[PDB]
């Protein structure tokens, strides 16, 4: 028995990450095992750590938490540093539009857990942490129970399957800060402090939790690792483009008919995600824009791009918020501005004041109270949140809004 959760629709063409999580219910360990689960761990533990890193590298697996960094490479970089090492699963998923990670957590926790154990063995971590946002209480309890299940069966603890490898997984809860998703802030939170991002360098893979080499990976990234071991890197590479291989989760929301998570290859185009899979727009309205979470804005001219991490690709976390012709872009921009206003940690002055002023001024623009100087001020502020910023939030807090200014000049002009 767990706290109530919504029933998010899920659909898959690959039947990998959503093999079970396409059904909205907790799949416990016996059902996981009946479905061939914990086979990858077995196979992995018969491989050397260096072999696993090699396979994950050759798989072309990339981080699914936003930065799209090659996972194998991250592991390689970490293990260049003497241990002990920590492995951290990032389950803070708090960006607007993004609800992809939770359906793995809440429906198929053993997929994630199996991934964490394999990844931990790979980098020589005997201690792992899931940092899950506080607003996912069910996820927290589901994971706590699942970990104990795996422990009962001998997939955690000491001498896992006689391999000589020891692992414990601890579950930490966040407490309502989006910035705790940033890997250094997460680590600060993990050590029982405020979620203030650290000045980098150093980077976590050298100095992270307790200053020790630390690998942070997104829930979805880690969820791929069992399939890489199981199928082999070659077969995994055949899934979608050789360039950006494997399944990807696409959380699709807004004015589509069939909002939910879609498991699709990353050579799927944005037009396909909306129209082929998500059933087009509510009332067959014209797409005006697609917000990539709170990161980017794509116009209706940019629908024929792939959902991969190529230069002209959608990128990000594959979060698809669909705006139609009836939706006001300035109103939407304000919401995105409001998000950044409420989530800046306040350490850096331009981020601190910029996030605030962008929202403050944009609200005046929307309310029709803005002076000419307010407009000019809004322009300047939007372009000057990033300076001195020591994390990615300051660098992107004005990105989407700027794209709306460039791509939808007419709509903004109305408000002038």
């Amino acid at each position: 028995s767990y706290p109530a959760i919504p029933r998010i629709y899920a659909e898959t063409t690959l039947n990998m990450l959503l093999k079970r999580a396409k059904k909205p219910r907790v799949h416990s360990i016996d059902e996981y095992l009946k479905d061939g689960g914990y086979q990858a761990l077995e196979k992995a533990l018969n491989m050397s750590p260096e072999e696993i890193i090699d396979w994950v590298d050759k798989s072309t697996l990339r981080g699914r938490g936003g930065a799209g960094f090659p996972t194998g490479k991250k592991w390689k970089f970490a293990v260049q540093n003497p241990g002990p090492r920590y492995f951290i699963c990032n389950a803070d998923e708090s960006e607007p539009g993004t609800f992809k990670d939770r359906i793995i957590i809440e429906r198929d926790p053993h997929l994630l857990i199996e991934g964490i154990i394999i990844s931990s063995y790979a980098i020589g971590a005997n201690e792992a942490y899931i940092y899950i946002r506080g607003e996912y209480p069910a996820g927290y309890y589901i994971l706590r129970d699942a970990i104990e299940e795996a422990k009962k069966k001998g997939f955690l603890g000491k001498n896992i399957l006689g391999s000589g490898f020891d692992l414990e997984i601890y579950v930490a809860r966040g407490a309502g800060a989006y910035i705790c998703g940033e890997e250094t802030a997460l680590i600060e939170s993990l050590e029982g402090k405020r979620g203030h991002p650290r000045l980098k360098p150093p980077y976590p893979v050298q100095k992270g939790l307790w200053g020790k080499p630390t690998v942070v990976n997104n829930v979805e990234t880690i969820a791929n690792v069992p399939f890489i071991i199981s199928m082999g890197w070659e077969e995994y590479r055949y899934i979608g483009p050789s360039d950006y291989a494997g399944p990807k989760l696409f959380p699709v929301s807004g004015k589509v008919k069939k909002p939910g998570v879609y498991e699709l290859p990353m050579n799927t185009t944005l037009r396909e995600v909306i129209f082929k899979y998500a059933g087009g727009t509510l009332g067959n309205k014209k797409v005006k824009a697609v917000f990539s979470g709170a990161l980017d804005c794509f116009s209706s001219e940019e629908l024929d791009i792939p959902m991969d991490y190529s230069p002209l690709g959608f990128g990000g976390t594959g979060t698809v918020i669909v705006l139609t012709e009836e939706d006001d872009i300035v109103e939407a921009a304000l919401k995105i501005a409001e998000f950044y206003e409420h989530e800046t940690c306040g350490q850096c002055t331009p981020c601190r004041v910029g996030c605030y002023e962008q929202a403050n001024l944009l609200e005046k623009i929307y309310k029709g109270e803005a002076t000419e100087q307010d407009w000019e001020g809004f322009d300047f502020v939007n372009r000057n949140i990033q300076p001195t910023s020591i994390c990615g939030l300051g660098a992107v807090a004005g990105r989407l809004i700027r794209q709306t200014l460039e791509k939808f000049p007419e709509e903004w002009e109305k408000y002038r």
Binding site: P6, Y9, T98, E135, A172, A177, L190, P259, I321, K335
Partner: protein, 155 residues
């Protein structure tokens, strides 16, 4: 100030859980809010001691994290998403229903002191917008009559 035995048990549990005591700080604060309906200022000096942390650290942690409330006591917190997708799909309809049923607005507590409406950023359930929570429970808003039934489960 003294923690009741039943709460203190659970706090010591959290402290034992992680390899280092201080790591339990958010689990402890979560626990305290659930027990009291808020974080009593006077609760933090005994917490800090259990954590082996300076009071100033514990206080700053409470201040930073948006989920912890130091001012208002409330049995049940109705976290209403006010972010982009929920706004698109009808946050203000949900707020209207809450106003009809409870007579309160975002940031307010019923005179009863049992419900507080807490505006929050994206709850990571956007496909099911508009979304809200009642404490740990999470729901899509469908209609006033549904909301009434949902809220009636909390006494």
């Amino acid at each position: 100030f003294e923690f009741p035995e039943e709460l203190k048990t659970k706090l010591q549990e959290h402290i034992n859980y992680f390899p280092k005591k201080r790591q339990a700080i958010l689990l402890c604060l979560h626990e305290i809010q659930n027990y009291y309906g808020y974080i009593p200022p006077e609760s933090l000096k005994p917490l800090a001691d259990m954590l082996e942390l300076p009071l100033n650290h514990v206080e700053g942690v409470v201040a930073f994290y948006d989920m912890f409330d130091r001012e208002d006591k409330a049995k049940y917190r109705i976290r209403v998403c006010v972010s982009i997708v929920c706004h698109l799909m009808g946050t203000n309809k949900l707020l209207k229903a809450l106003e009809n049923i409870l007579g309160i607005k975002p940031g307010e507590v019923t005179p009863d002191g049992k419900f507080k409406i807490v505006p929050v950023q994206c709850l990571g359930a956007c496909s099911e917008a508009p979304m809200f929570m009642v404490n740990d429970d999470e729901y899509k808003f469908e209609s006033e009559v549904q909301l009434n039934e949902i809220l009636s489960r909390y006494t």
